[PDB]
Amino acid sequence: PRDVTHLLALVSSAIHAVENPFGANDLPYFRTLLKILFVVLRAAKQITQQVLTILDRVVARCFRALAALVTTTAPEDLALITAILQACLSVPGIEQCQVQVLNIMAAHDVFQVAVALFSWADSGDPVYGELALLFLLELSALPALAEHLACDGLLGHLAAARLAGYMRRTNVGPFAENAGAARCYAIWAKCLLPLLLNILAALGSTVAPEVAWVLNQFPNLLQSSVERISLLEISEIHSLALLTRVLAACDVPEVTWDGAKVLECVEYWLRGRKVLRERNRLEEKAVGLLVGVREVLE
Secondary structure (H helix, E strand, O other), rough: OOOOHHHHHHHHHHHOOOOOOOOOOOHHHHHHHHHHHHHHHHHHOOOHHHHHHHHHHHHHHHHHHHHOOOOOOOOOOHHHHHHHHHHOOOOOOHHHHHHHHHHHHOOOOOOHHHHHHHHHHOOOHHHHHHHHHHHHHHHOOHHHHHHHHHHHEEEEEOOOOHHHHHHHOOOOOOOOOOOOOOHHHHHHHHHHHHHHHHHOOHHHHHHHHHHHHHHHHHHHHHHHHOOOOOOHHHHHHHHHHHHOOOOOOOOOOOOOOHHHHHHHOOOOOOOOOOOOOOHHHHHHHHHHHHHHHHOOOO
């Protein structure tokens, strides 16, 4: 344990020496191993053939082995694996090899297992749902896998899921009462909207029907999104603020949104930077986003 790349191989040499991960006995040690692996990987951002082996024998292995809920495996080590993946794909030298990631991730039945897993989330809250979506979202971060997602038909298997139900019900938003609703929104804000934009970056026109179709299947959220005016709210009116603009420059239904009120809704809550002090950290970066919204949509 001394170099950036050598330190990363031996933790996996330990992660390979594992007997039966997620086994109630040798689980808590496996967790620590994973966390060490994560710490290394996050700080392993300055050889690439090293981070790919764990994308095979760690991420894609455990993500299936863990998908079998059927021991005391929390909905947090799933997040850990999700975060290890996130830690992996951020290595400066994988985008050069994006095609191999898909082969590795598709070798294991990850993509389908994610959608399988996704259905199984629904105490009124979709804990595992947001996770499987964040995972698939982390895959789709790069176009090569988003391509396989759209091609495999994620939106078809997703839009038909009961998860769509609570999102379509007028009881959803950033600031909700019970958890499941707030999380149900958090999914809309943190999964779809950013996931759509990822599958859009793989010849959007072809999949434009799908993204518009799903976007239109959640009208309440759209009608809410404009009449809402936290940061998710801003990212919500930044994704939708670009998901209907691309469609305005390319055989499928249109965007049932009213991006009209938006332009005169940004100027209301921008200039002055005083009224914004009721929702520092949550202004410099926060107010920074809406600078972009009211520039491309003019």
